[PDB]
Amino acid sequence: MSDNEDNFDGDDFDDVEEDEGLDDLENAEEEGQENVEILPSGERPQANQKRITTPYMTKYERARVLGTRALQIAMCAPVMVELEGETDPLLIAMKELKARKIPIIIRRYLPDGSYEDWGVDELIITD
């Protein structure tokens, strides 16, 4: 009946519980390090670059994609599913991967001192 918490600081371990995932991203891995840009597929036979981007895009390029698609598409949809009839925060960025079509190029730069561009027009999609 009258049982409440005395305060909110019994020790020095009650300030680490801020999680902002979504539908299946509970601080699992997300470990990486590559500046990644996003753009509509573009295997331009002229900007053939190279450096470290494994000839196979990596879920982040697609995870930045989904996020940068989720907003571009949240407007209409550069996506390949609901071009202008949908704008969900990521159904499209999901559907696009869920489709594994990921028709888009991504730039994996390197905060280390390098960079490479391409995505699904020259290599893999999310995986």
Domain positions in the chain: 1-127
27 contact partners, CB below 8 Å, separation of at least 6: 19, 21
Task: Write b or e for each residue in 95-122: b if 16 or more Cβ atoms lie within 10 A of its Cβ, otherwise e.
Answer: bbbeeeebebbbbbbeeeeebbbbbbbb
CA angle 45, 84, 97 (to 5 degrees): 55
Rounded Cα distance between 118 and 110, Å, is 14
| Residue linked to tokens 């697609």 | 62
Rounded Cα distance between 23 and 9, Å, is 31
Method: NMR
CA angle 78, 82, 88 (to 5 degrees): 85
Rounded Cα distance between 87 and 92, Å, is 7
- Burial (CB < 10 A; 0-12, 13-18, 19+), residue 34, is buried
Rounded Cα distance between 51 and 5, Å, is 56
Rounded Cα distance between 49 and 55, Å, is 11
Specify the CATH class of 1-127 in words: alpha beta
